[PDB]
Amino acid sequence: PNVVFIKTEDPDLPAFYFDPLINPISHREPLPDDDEEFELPEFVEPFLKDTPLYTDNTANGIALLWAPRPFNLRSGRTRRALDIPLVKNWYREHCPAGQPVKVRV
Amino acid sequence: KSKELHAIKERYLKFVFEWDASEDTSIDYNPLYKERHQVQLLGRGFIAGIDLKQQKREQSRFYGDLMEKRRTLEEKEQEEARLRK
Amino acid sequence: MEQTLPVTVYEMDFLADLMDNSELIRNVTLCGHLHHGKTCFVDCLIEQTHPEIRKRYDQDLCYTDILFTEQERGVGIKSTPVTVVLPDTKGKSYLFNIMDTPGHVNFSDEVTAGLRISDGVVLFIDAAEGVMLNTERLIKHAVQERLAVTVCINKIDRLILELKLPPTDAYYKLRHIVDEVNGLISMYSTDENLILSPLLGNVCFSSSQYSICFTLGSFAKIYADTFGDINYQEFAKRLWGDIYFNPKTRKFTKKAPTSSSQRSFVEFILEPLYKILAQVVGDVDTSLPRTLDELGIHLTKEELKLNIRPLLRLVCKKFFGEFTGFVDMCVQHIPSPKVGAKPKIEHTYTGGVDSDLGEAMSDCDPDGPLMCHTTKMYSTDDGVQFHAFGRVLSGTIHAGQPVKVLGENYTLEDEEDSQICTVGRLWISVARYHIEVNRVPAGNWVLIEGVDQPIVKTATITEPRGNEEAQIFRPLKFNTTSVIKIAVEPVNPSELPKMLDGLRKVNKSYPSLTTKVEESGEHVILGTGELYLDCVMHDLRKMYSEIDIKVADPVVTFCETVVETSSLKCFAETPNKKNKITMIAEPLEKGLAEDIENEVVQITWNRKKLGEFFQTKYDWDLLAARSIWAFGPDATGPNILVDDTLPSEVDKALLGSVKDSIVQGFQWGTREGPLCDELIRNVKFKILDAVVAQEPLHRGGGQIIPTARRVVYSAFLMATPRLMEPYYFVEVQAPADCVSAVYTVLARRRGHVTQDAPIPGSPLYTIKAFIPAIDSFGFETDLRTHTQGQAFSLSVFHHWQIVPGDPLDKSIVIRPLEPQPAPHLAREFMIKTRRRKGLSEDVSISK
Amino acid sequence: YLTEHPDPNNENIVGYNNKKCWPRDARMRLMKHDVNLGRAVFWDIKNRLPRSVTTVQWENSFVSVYSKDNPNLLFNMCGFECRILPKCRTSYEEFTHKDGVWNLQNEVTKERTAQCFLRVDDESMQRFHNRVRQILMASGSTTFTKIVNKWNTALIGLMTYFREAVV
């Protein structure tokens, strides 16, 4: 299933923000009457209410979910320096169009 | 068209340092398999290695206009402010 | 009972004693579009009823994709039943018979074979994607089969963790999904009691990956459990819609206090969930322990070291708990077998509900006459013997008991298809492991051994020496038509019997597989698409016959029709040459063939109602409108037969002695067709002067039927014959940039785009288009390759359309190995299908 | 034939010798009628000979049928590999003077009714190759003139016996 992770661009925007890349939702119920005698008790409030919705590292910590390994980790075991290919994911990509034949071969 | 018919007919009937360029695949007749559509990654993801400014110049410009359409004037001025930063 | 089993939260004796109480049983099917999250619904559920079965951190054990091709292919290919005792919100336990159906559009026959034995439906709807092709198709199919529909809007983390929508716009997205579902439901159903809304408990919100599942009542019960003094059932009625909390007066109004005030769902349900997820994924080191303290969750230090995704799953598991919103939803809105046994008999029993056995079965009485209905056949891993799987609608099936398996052609006078067999064992089937039991009462699902021989697709299993007038349950009616067609032959022709046996075994496996032996000695398989036939051939080669099988190129089934009325009225005499018939053929009116096929009209109607229909709907005079004799090659095939013989010209009473034979001749000659031995569609046959021989020894039998067939052929041939292509309906979801590439890919395959439109709240687009079925092989591969994987299509059969050319034209020159221009596609399709069927090289147009 | 040797599963198409050196469209095409006609003809001819004096084994024969299904007639005569293909049949093409092709013509009307593409038998090519192998292998201490003399003898024999078939 296609990932629809909308990559962020401004650090000065809310973490949860209706991006312009996202197609608008075109706006348009057995509820009880207001006079119905249901009262929420005095010491009842939504669960986390003093907790702010987003923090200054909520946008960045969501972008880490969609990072390539090892950046989608937060702990792990060390490797040897020679066991880490830094270009093995470069040539697993599609053969680039327009490069001379030597590069594609 | 001619290579397509030939493909159908074919289907149904010394120390060399450099690689020989006759070892190459990817020479198709189908224009869908030669001129592929390139991923734009919502215009915010890029390719590894290549120079960032070059990619930003060479991208398809679809999402720039789609921003310019959908973005409201407040989001437009905020995006311009980041651009000037 | 005496079988080694994985440890369960409940105990198997409780499961065995819940089966005898048919008000604590829920036969549910899980369905939705592809990859919309159904597998782990049950999997995350099997975890909570199976403490030691735990999903691997980095990889989900699907536990319902038990097969091989499912495991590496990563698609659901077969339905898999799961039986679990699941606790409720109030702690009560119910026995859930869940059927996990695949969501690929090709494998819908599994969905129908799971809908037959179910009393309700849970439709899974990805929250980011929305309502897709198979969501609408399964909604139509499930309100047609008269099932109680609920909805689980799954994958709601994607709104938070991928789209990052503000909680209020997530609310708008969920409300929009619910409204789309409601509109579809009202489209396909007259009565209004299938209104879906989270205020009725009808809609559940879930995220199976992270062990989230709630209704409004279960979240309100979370509140009530923490702050003890709220009545969670009246709280739940204020947690959706345009109802706002007024925190100064502590009361819920219908109008927002002042402004910038949030609806009750956002304020009380969605903001806490956003904050849990955001605290876990963003501030895990900084301020996650403080909020886990607030919620009352304590994770051991070895668990706060977990990666972010296992940590999120564990945190949400602790906060939410078990999936009791699901059980609430299904117990309240899905009938028990006892209560849903009346629609089941009303709909799927050939004997009518008014029959005596249609009364003893509608009580779901486990001490009555045995009536078990099996729709699936599951193969033991050795691939030798199958096990039937259905539900016991009445009586009680015992291991060792001799039973009487009735086929699909069994009738009360033609009793040769029934066959006595001997039940060997009875397994209650959880997904992977079978729990062998000794008996299974009414209202339950059982895996039977011993009755696998005399059944091909479905069965009705009854008792011998009683139940003398037990008819069958109607054979499954499917969503689609099987159109794609491949022919097979063994590499070494010495082992043909092995491949024939393998073909029988795959015919048992797949509910809508149709293997037939054409006239030319050619063995043909009909399928729904490329994935379907790929898996059918995979099974045939590797499971049921261990030989090497050749595969022909895929082709489609065509159909034959006309485009005017036959120029000169045609005729045909018997070899006796005393009986003479005369017909002309003309095309049915627009939109009537679908009415005949979709049982909007039947010939079981009395002549009055039939004539009244035809009159008011397609401008027919009472004479002809009541004159209809038969309907297509089937009882519901898309062709009519009308007798325009005037009562003065021909004795109507004497003509009535050959009505029963003209009808059969027309049926057979429409079943075959003269062009390329394909069905005839959308053709009206009017008789004009049927001179009948008085001598009964001269008419009737093998003299008049072939004459009727031959006049049918000639009359069809004098009206300009045409061929017909199956047309596929393609829905593609691609980003906005790759939308034009979809147009580029389509146009090369005679494809025509009906519409492209954004997906609300999603960055993607949906291109819907029509493509000929024959111009579709590799279209998915072309689209997914040209777009670098970013565009994906599921395609499904829609209608029958005319091939561009004219099939009967010898002026056309066709070369052997190159694609034709459209002007003469019909001629090629006609002659190559004739060559492949084994017939002559070309037609003989004559009288 | 089928009365004497019935085929229920259509297995007559497994032991059929073909001329593998021609293209797939220019070989024999093993339709059921043609395969059965070839087998029937061979069985008829074989039954005439008493098995004690001499026999004709199937594995060393090649029965090629020309019918509505097979448009080429094929045979192997005196080392040559011929393939006749009538002009009124699947040719539908103007032909220039190709070296290997023989322009057969009807003797009464002097019209090109067919062609006969020629080749060299695989047996003959292998025999010549083995002769050259004998040349190289048996050399040892012989002068160079003897080696080239043997090569020229082999080449002249081959290329004056198979004049256009080599080309």
Ligand SMILES: Nc1nc2c(ncn2[C@@H]2O[C@H](COP(=O)(O)OP(=O)(O)OP(=O)(O)O)[C@@H](O)[C@H]2O)c(=O)[nH]1
């Ligand atoms: N983001 C997200 N992904 C999920 C969630 N639940 C499942 N998935 C993933 O989405 C995909 C759906 O796979 P399944 O759940 O097996 O699919 P299915 O719904 O059974 O459908 P079929 O493939 O037709 O059987 C897998 O990659 C899952 O891991 C969820 O709540 N959120």
